[PDB]
């Protein structure tokens, strides 16, 4: 018969009319033969039933034949077969509620799985097709969870609770925090004052965050090298640590890991791990630094690129004027016997110039 679905705490309207269309007696009773609400002229009445003060009928629409049933704050346990006994007939209506929910809630960063468990009347079965804000028609049973959330799955999903030839949609919101960059990379040269930058997406919240950056200097296995920072609103501050180089950090939220002079030993990888809370997790975002050193020995020269270079790149040294004085695929090339010209050291890959460091020759 009438099988209408509903959402927890939402509301729903049970129809009930008949011919004759005039203000006549009617009475809604559940399968337990208990009277939800009834009438006696304009005076609308209800019953002892648990549903009581959450049920209602539209007296205006009464005149036109409807003797509608409006259930407010939908209690899961409202799932029943109600009957609208109107003027000489019975209307059987089963209202099956549902309730899609994620328990892992508040402040979801990347990966950290999302879970969707469902509420339903003891005896009926649902099926959930969670359409994502972008693609993936992820579906499951009384439960379906999204694996490790990747940025693009941020937004508003639209899971559908299928049950019967009826179905009830659900709008759950899922936003994936996750730095706005994967592997940042900076190409500089022995001297150039290095800067780094990893942004977020504003937010407030109480006592919420701190982590640190870890670095794997090239060759210098001398790890445990780092800088630690605590954050609170648009306020950041180094917990302590730094040492080693003079890395300076900002007072302001848009973090700027500053490297005074790009000295050669400061080349390598790094992970900047952020971890805040309410219901924690820890963000990560990669960092890397390369250095180039163009320096003539005596009457003869050389230049070298340290750090995370690709086995696909090339280095070259020419005096600018004429073409390739030396072209090669490595990080420490040499050009013995140079001629006067403001020489350019070149690091690239494929074609587009990566690192460029100028220097002159004398005689």
Q: φ, ψ for residue 31 (rounded to 5)?
A: -55, -15
Phi/psi zone of residue 107: left (φ > 0), alpha (ψ -120 to 50 degrees), beta? left
Closest CA to 110 of 150, 146, 145, 153: 150
DSSP assignment of 290-346: EEEEE---SSSEEEEEESS--TT--EEEE-SSSS-SEEESSSEEEESS--SSEEEEE
270 and 287 Cβ atoms separated by less than 8 Å: yes
* Gap between the Cα atoms of 342 and 139, Å rounded: 64
* Gap between the Cα atoms of 160 and 167, Å rounded: 7
Structure token digits, residue 32 = 């337990």
Please determine, looking at this structure, whether the domain spanning 99-180 carries the CATH number 3.40.640.10: no
Determined by X-ray
* Gap between the Cα atoms of 287 and 214, Å rounded: 9
Instruction: Please report, to the nearest 10 degrees, the dihedral formed by the alpha carbons of residues 343, 345, 350, 352 taken in order.
Output: -70
Resolution in A: 4.0
The CATH code that applies to domain 181-291 is 2.60.40.10
For residue 163, give the H/E element and its range.
strand 158-163
Side-chain half-sphere exposure of 98, counting CA atoms within 13 A: 26
Structure token digits, residue 285 = 């975002």
- Count the Cβ atoms, other than its own, within 10 Å of residue 9: 12
Q: φ, ψ for residue 228 (rounded to 5)?
A: -115, 140
The contacts of residue 121 (CB under 8 Å, 6+ apart) are: 76, 79, 96, 97
* Residue boundaries of the structural domains of the chain: 1-98, 99-180, 181-291, 292-363
Buried (b) or exposed (e) across 50-78, using 16+ Cβ within 10 A? ebeebbbbeeeebeebbbbbebeebebeb
Domains 1-98 and 181-291 share a fold: yes
DSSP assignment of 271-286: EEEE-BTTTT--EEEE
Q: φ, ψ for residue 275 (rounded to 5)?
A: -155, 115
Please determine, looking at this structure, whether the domain spanning 1-98 carries the CATH number 3.30.70.890: no
Sign of CA dihedral 251, 215, 219, 301: negative
Closest CA to 234 of 213, 205, 258, 212: 205
* Gap between the Cα atoms of 45 and 39, Å rounded: 5
* Gap between the Cα atoms of 267 and 144, Å rounded: 45
β-sheet with 137-140: strand ranges across: 137-140, 128-131, 158-163, 166-170
Superfamily of domain 292-363: Immunoglobulins (2.60.40.10)
290 and 186 Cβ atoms separated by less than 8 Å: yes
* Gap between the Cα atoms of 22 and 65, Å rounded: 6
For residue 207, the 8-state DSSP code is S
- Count the Cβ atoms, other than its own, within 10 Å of residue 301: 21
Closest CA to 267 of 292, 241, 242, 302: 292
* Gap between the Cα atoms of 351 and 288, Å rounded: 21
DSSP assignment of 66-102: ---EEE-S--GGG-EEEEEEETTEEEEEEEEEEEEE-
């Amino acid at each position: 018969k009438k099988v209408v679905l509903g959402k927890k705490g939402d509301t729903v309207e049970l129809t009930c009319t008949a011919s004759q269309k005039k203000s006549i007696q009617f009475h809604w009773k559940n399968s337990n033969q208990i009277k939800i609400l009834g009438n006696q002229g304009s005076f609308l009445t209800k019953g002892p039933s648990k549903l009581n003060d959450r049920a209602d009928s539209r007296r205006s629409l009464w005149d036109q034949g409807n003797f509608p049933l409006i259930i407010k704050n939908l209690k899961i346990e409202d799932s029943d077969t109600y009957i609208c006994e109107v003027e000489d007939q019975k209307e059987e209506v089963q209202l099956l509620v549902f309730g899609l929910t994620a328990n892992s809630d508040t402040h979801l960063l990347q990966g950290q799985s999302l879970t969707l468990t469902l509420e339903s009347p003891p005896g009926s079965s649902p099926s959930v097709q969670c359409r994502s804000p972008r693609g993936k028609n992820i579906q499951g049973g009384k439960t379906l969870s999204v694996s490790q959330l990747e940025l693009q799955d941020s937004g508003t999903w639209t899971c559908t609770v299928l049950q019967n030839q009826k179905k009830v949609e659900f709008k759950i919101d899922i936003v994936v925090l996750a730095f706005q960059k994967a592997s940042s990379i900076v190409y500089k040269k022995e001297g150039e004052q290095v800067e780094f930058s990893f942004p977020l997406a504003f937010t407030v919240e109480k006592l919420t965050g701190s982590g640190e950056l870890w670095w794997q200097a090239e060759r210098a296995s001398s790890s445990k090298s780092w800088i630690t920072f605590d954050l609170k609103n648009k306020e950041v501050s180094v917990k302590r640590v730094t040492q080693d180089p003079k890395l300076q950090m900002g007072k302001k939220l848009p973090l700027h890991l500053t490297l005074p002079q790009a000295l050669p030993q400061y080349a390598g990888s790094g992970n900047l791990t952020l971890a805040l809370e309410a219901k924690t997790g820890k963000l990560h975002q990669e960092v890397n630094l390369v250095v180039m050193r163009a320096t003539q020995l005596q009457k003869n020269l050389t230049c070298e690129v340290w750090g995370p270079t690709s086995p696909k790149l090339m280095l070259s040294l020419k005096l600018e004027n004429k073409e390739a004085k030396v072209s090669k695929r490595e990080k420490a090339v040499w050009v013995l016997n140079p001629e006067a010209g403001m020489w350019q050291c070149l690091l690239s890959d494929s074609g587009q110039v990566l690192l460029e460091s100028n220097i002159k020759v004398l005689p």
